[PDB]
Every structure is written in C-alpha cells, then in structure tokens.
Symmetry: D2
Subunit: 255 residues, 4 copies
C-alpha cells in the first residue's frame, strides 16, 4: 500500500517522539489504506555548523524509538552514518535510512543490507536519476530485498535545490520511489509555502510513498526549523494526496 514516512527531524527527546507518535498512530487508524512509518534521527551527523544540535546519542535514540514502536505499534525508520551503526539500529528500525551525501558509500549500503531490514536511500543532490540504478545493485548484492529511493531535490546553482519530477518514473524502473516533501524545499546552507504544492505534484506524477518531517512547533525545532511541517497540518495533506492519487493513479505509466 501507499507509504507515508513521517516524524520529527531529530530526536530532541523521547517526549517529543511520543507526542508525535500519538498523532501518527491516530492517522494510522484513520487511514487504514496507508502504511505509516515513524521517522526521527538519533544524530544529525552532517550539520553545517559545529555548534548546532546533533542529538543525544545512538543508545538514547534507539531507546526512544523503541518506546514508540512498543507504545504505538508503529514501524520505525532512522538513518545511519557509519557502518557499525547498522547492526544496533536494525534492532528497532524496520527501514534503515541512508543519508543523501552518503548514497555512494558502498560499506554503509552493504552494512544496511546485511541487517536484513528494508533500506531507503536518499538520492544525493549530485546524482542523476539514472545513476541510482547502481545504488540499487549494491543493495541487492548485499542481500537487500526491500529497497526504496527517495527524491529530495538536486543541486541547482548555489544554496538551492530543484525537484526534477522526471526522476520519479526513471527511478521506478529499479526501486520503489518515495518523495521527500520537506527536504526538497530546503535551501542548503527553505520555503514551507512550497511543501504542499510539490507533494501534490509528486502524487500526480506517481510515487510509492511520501516522506515528511513534522514537528508540533517547527519554529522551535532544533533542526530543520524552516522546513518541518506543523503536526496539525499532516492530516489535511495526507487526505489531499490520497484523493489526488486515487484519481491520478489511473494514468500512472506502466513501469
């Protein structure tokens, strides 16, 4: 079924995770046609500044995510940054996320695949759509069976990302495709006003799921404060994309 990956960018506390998980659970019960996956990072390992918020560590993060899966029965996904993190994260993560800058790091991909979990690779801002075929091949070689590729924009001049929707049908040739609605509008080194319009475009074109970072109060977020979707707006957007998908799906081109 259609996938909706959502949650706060970073694990600011398992308190926040529980408050967001509660809403994700409610939507999960309301939209039985959709498969929800809770997401949050235990570490922002690639912040621009050395003085920015990274997180509370792997152990604290896995614990918090563990509480979300136990308390709400929701699937989990988080990203890893170095090979050794794949094993401990796989304990709770149903889907292991590979950061965009690291989409070409062979050992990280292999380490994720070895865990037997599903793998979701964020497409690097430097990669062409067709370049992702090799990424999928590495994962298959590593034993991965459930593979996703996430569109999150491509480098367009400096401090700007553009979404080339031609990427969706191209990547669908070798993997399930996810559209990152919040990451695609960020200005590297973003505009929330474009999150909804572009996600509508994503489902009109055709994808297997959407990815959205959401926070009760984005402006207070410790990471991605300018792009995280306010929690209260999630339901409306999901209902909207489901309706558009229902009508547009008749026209999705065959593989």
């Amino acid at each position: 079924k259609f996938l909706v990956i959502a949650g706060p960018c970073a694990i600011e506390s398992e308190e926040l995770l529980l408050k967001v998980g509660e809403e994700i659970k409610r939507l999960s019960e309301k939209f039985k046609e959709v498969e929800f996956v809770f997401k949050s990072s235990f570490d922002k390992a690639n912040r621009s500044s050395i003085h920015s918020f990274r997180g509370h560590g792997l152990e604290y993060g896995v614990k918090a995510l563990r509480k979300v899966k136990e308390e709400f029965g929701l699937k989990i996904t988080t990203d890893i940054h170095e090979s050794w993190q794949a094993e401990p994260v796989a304990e709770v993560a149903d889907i292991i996320q590979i950061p965009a800058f690291l989409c070409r790091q062979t050992d990280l991909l292999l380490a994720a695949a070895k865990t037997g979990r599903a793998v979701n690779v964020k497409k690097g801002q430097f990669l062409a759509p067709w370049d992702t075929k090799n990424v999928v091949e590495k994962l298959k070689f590593g034993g991965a069976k459930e593979i996703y590729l996430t569109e999150r924009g491509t480098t367009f001049g400096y401090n700007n990302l553009v979404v080339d929707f031609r990427s969706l049908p191209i990547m669908k040739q070798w993997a399930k495709v996810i559209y990152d609605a919040t990451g695609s509008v960020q200005l590297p080194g973003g505009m929330r006003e474009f999150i909804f319009p572009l996600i509508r475009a994503a489902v009109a074109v055709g994808c297997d799921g959407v990815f959205m970072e959401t926070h009760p109060e984005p402006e207070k977020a410790l990471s991605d404060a300018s792009t995280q979707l306010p929690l209260s707006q999630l339901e409306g957007i999901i209902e909207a994309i489901l309706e558009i998908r229902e009508v547009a799906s008749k026209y999705y081109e065959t593989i």
Copy 2:
C-alpha cells in the same frame, strides 16, 4: 474559472495541416465546454539552431492560414512575433500574441504587442528566475496590456537540458495568469546537434504535475504525425493523444483544486 488549453502544430507547415488539426481542436472544444481552446501555430521559426532548418512560408501566408482556421472553426488564435513591426499585422488575426522565450526581455517587442489591445502570453526565458517575471508583467501593463499570461517552459539545467521548477507556478501567479508548456519543457535544446531533441515520455507525467500544483492553462504543440514534423519532431504530441491528455488533466485539476493556495 475556465481552463485554458493552447494547442496546435508548432509551425504552419501548410494551410492543410492547420485545418486538419483545427478540426480536431474544434471537436474537443465541443466536448470539453469548460475549457477555452486557443489554436496555436507559428508563421515563422525565427530561432532555429541551424540555418538549414525549416522556418516557414512567411507572415502573409501564415496569417491567411490562421484566419482560415478562425473562420472555418470559430477558434481563438495565437501566434508568436519576433520583431516589433510584426505586432500590428499579427494582431489582425491573433487573439493572443505570443512572445518567444529568448525575447521575453526585449522591451520594444513587449510594448509592440501590448499596444495592439490583444492579450499577451510571454514564454518565460530559460535564463529567467520566477521572481524576475514581475518586471516583465510591469512592462506589459505599462504598454497597455490588460490580459497577460506567463508560460513556464523550463529552465537551463546544465547543457542541452531543461528542468521544470514547479515552484515557479505559485510564484508567477502573484502577478499574472500562468500557463504550463507541456511540450517545450521536455525538449533538449540543441540535443541533436543541428536540431534540438526531446523526451516525449515525460510530457504526460509533467503536465499532471502542473495541474496538481495549479495553473490557469496548458500549452501543447500537437501534430498528426510528430515523426514527420518540420520542427520539434521530438516533442510535439501525437494529435490522437490530445483528447486523453485533456480529459486527464481536467480530472486531476478538479480533485486538486480545493487545495490550490490563495495568492
């Protein structure tokens, strides 16, 4: 508001070609009554890459051919101008005067079109940022234009490639009605060396994106047999597929419409 569909063969290869396409557009206009159709065709391809490529049969012949389409089918007409002096004669038949993408900053051309009293549709230059179309609209208003359109047709992305930044739709909507050029946006400028290339397989997906985001109309160059077209053979939509595409975008527009943001 009535959705606009601008369509027709890229170039006026012959008056016969125009009437054939015009007949189909007229038929669709009778079926899709909620759509405002405007027949398009260029009397001159003044910016071909190669000196050896087809340009046209002249302004005189073209206008005459376009007038025949309007007379026979009662369809609104649009064609593009390339130099200031062409605005007057063209305004005699054209309901909408089109400004080529490379010429979107040529003040005199914009002014020439604006003083005719006809509607003006400016193709957004591949070098222009969305927010910089505000001054383009200002020039037209200054020149007397009362009905203005801005057409998204892609932006230079590396060499011989164009990308469509859909954020341009809501940005440009701030100052003019917005049209999405479904066939021009998938062309590969100079992709074939002496001619430009294109990827027809992406025409439909991107037009679905356009209506989901929200626009005031779509622009599509269509030809009975694109493979044999004298210009844009790689991007013109087979005429037989026009009906299906229009039905689809009207369906997607309807379902997405309640979510279009207010400007």
Copy 3:
C-alpha cells in the same frame, strides 16, 4: 593581434564617450601590439525594468560613435537589436555586436552579416559551447568573413552566471574567441572583485581578445553600475593580461 574591446556600457552622452575614447586612444598608442575597439550601446533594449535607462536613440548614438572614430581614429563596435538597425549602424560600426539573448535570432545575424562588417556574437546564457557552431554557420551563410564569439557566462541556478572555461578551446574550433570580463560577473536580475581574477584565467587558458565595459565612475553609470571597470584601472589590467598571455601562449593547444 590580440583584441581589446572596451568602452562605457551605454552612450550616456557623446561627452562621456569622448572622455573614455581619449583614454582608449592613449592606451592604443601605448600598446601597439594590441588592437583596440571602442564599444558603447546606443540602446539598452533588454533592461529588466521599464523605468530604467535605455539611451538617446540610434541616430544620436551613431553620431556620438562617429565623433569617436573621427576624433581618435579608433575602430567602433555597438550592438543591434532588430534587423533594420544593421544597415545604419554599419555606417560607423567596424564590428556589429549581437546581444546574448538574441544569439539565435536568424534574421538579426543575417542582417549583420549582409552589411559586410565583422560580427561579434555574445554567447547566450542558455547555449552550450558546442551549440555555437551553428551560430557561426548562419553568419558564414550570410556572407560574414570576420566572426567572433564572446564568452559571457552561463546560467547557473537563479540570478547567477558561471564561466565554464572549457568553452574557450571548444569555440576556438570555429571562430575567434573573446572573453567578456565585465558581463561574466554580473548577477542577472555582480561582484567587481572577480573581474581581474577571471580575466587572468581567460588569457591563461587562451582567447583572441577580451571585452570590458569601463566607466570613469561606475557607481554613477546609468547601466551596469555594479560591473563596469573604473577607467583608471584599465591600463594595469591590460598590461597584466599581456604579460600573462606572453608566457602562457607557449602552451595554448593547437586549434
């Protein structure tokens, strides 16, 4: 010999043209190895704003340029915007300049070629280096014998131009190549600090000439105030590029 095309962006008055022409003449006498061509536009036909300075008209402009050639014996170059302007401009213009946005307008190119004058086409920000071969062919078909292609940057994201120096050797295959040092640093819709560094790069790579818009007081210029080179700095830059060219020329690759 090496070409240096320089002058104020727009003809704000024949007074300005004479003051700049006087300096250009002095340098012309100092650098006999270089061929100087005086440049200025009689009309800025593509300003972003309808309220910006365009000029004093074709007639007034040609007259002013005519005075420069008569009073200083300098060659002249100015740009045309519509086909009908080629004939009257050719009366004084030794080199007819084709604006970047208009580099694909067949009739403008043909009209320029018909005059029998040399033609210098500014490479559109949307053109790939190899795409210029067809531009040259149009001019040759139109009777042009002296053809130049000028590098002035390529669209790089929004409101930014990047100079891909690979363009110089590529375009040299079919035409003489000129580097526009002032236009290449402008930010469409620039930084003067990069004019000199990039022009040094241009001659190190290898070109047939440089193009620079210069004004006694750029900040007071009616057009391109942010990129025009202060007149007093022209001599130093020319001497500098001549020295670099002298040494680097030993390494310029054969056609």
Copy 4:
C-alpha cells in the same frame, strides 16, 4: 610561499605501481625545489558507482605501500579516510589526511582527522557553495587542526557534468589555503554508466586558469598508463606529462603572482 603539488595514482593498484610513480615524483622534487611535493594514493575507493569496480587491497596493505614510498623516496604522504576509525592508523603514515568530497560535511570524520595532529585537506563537495566552506574550516579548527586545505574539484552542473567556478578560489582563500584538483574537475560523474567519465583535453587549460587566478597548490592524479588504470582511467594524467605541466604552471604562477589580490 612554497607551491604545493599533490600527485600520485588514484588508487593503490599495487606497491609496484606506487614505487614507479614515486620515483618520478622524487625526480621532479629534485628539479623543482621551489615546490613541496606530496605523494597521493587511495588505499580504498569507497564510493565507486558500481559494486563491480575496483576498490583496493585494504587499509593495512595500502598504509604499508605508502610507508614504503615515504621510506624509499623521503616524500610526504597523503591518502583519504572514509570512516572515523581510519584516521588513527592512517595518521601513522599520512602527513596530510584527505577528506572525500561527498563526506566534507560529516562532522565525526572531520573531527577524527583533526585530532591526529596531521594536516587536513578537504575536497569541496560538488553540492557546496564556496562560502559554505567557512563552517567546514571552523569544524576542523574546533577539532584541533592547525594546517587546513580546501580543494576545488568542480560543482554539479546539470547531470553527469561538473563546472569549475573559479570565483571559489579567492572566496575560500579567506579561511584556508586553496588547492585546485586538476583531474577531478574534468570528470563526468557516472558518465559511462557503471563508471564515471572525463575529458583529459581540458586538464591543462583549466590548471592554467587556476594558477592565473591564484591558488596555493594543485592536485593531480597521475598514472604511467591511464588507459589501463583501475579507477579514473579517463581523467588521470599520463605520468610522462607531469613534468611539462608543472613547469608550465610554475611559469604562469610567477608572471601572474604580482597581481594576486590580498585577502
């Protein structure tokens, strides 16, 4: 200041290959005494496009091979790390620890390299703007790095193509010494499908541009027979051409030097 020339085969194909290249670099270091040479080679290509491409013979073998080069020729050494744990063992032989372009924002990797006390050279990510390297240098200084380099190696320009924006040289010079990667800047990422492409014909012209603009050193991957290289076969410079290139850039640097702007 002494000009830096970082050169060597892309990957450590064998200890034999390293000694062959090392011998030539040593010879050039004896001729060009005004240049500081640093021998480069990767013990692992951890980011190949294809799972079937050559990666290397492991960290242990690589370090041993690099130490042999340093021992036999007395040359400074540089190699890249891919994960934090590699900084310590690599610092035992490497005078300069190299940070891969895709990893230029990985905080822990930068920190790992900085605490070794060795010099650190960061390849500028193809996604990074020049002004955003300021924070990269800040992270390294925070981590204890006292000798920092930033290497220009091109920026994403459309698909499978890189462009060198030379404005980056004077911008980055504001916070670190700047190196120009002459061979990486002409590669066509994923250009050959399973492998990346490249245009060797542009290596020399662009390196001439780099020294005319002004930089603190150049980086060049070189191999006796590039055509047979196991990695970057399309961009590595034939070893026989290294001497000529170095002589040329030293000549251009000298004549342009009086014009380098003060930061």
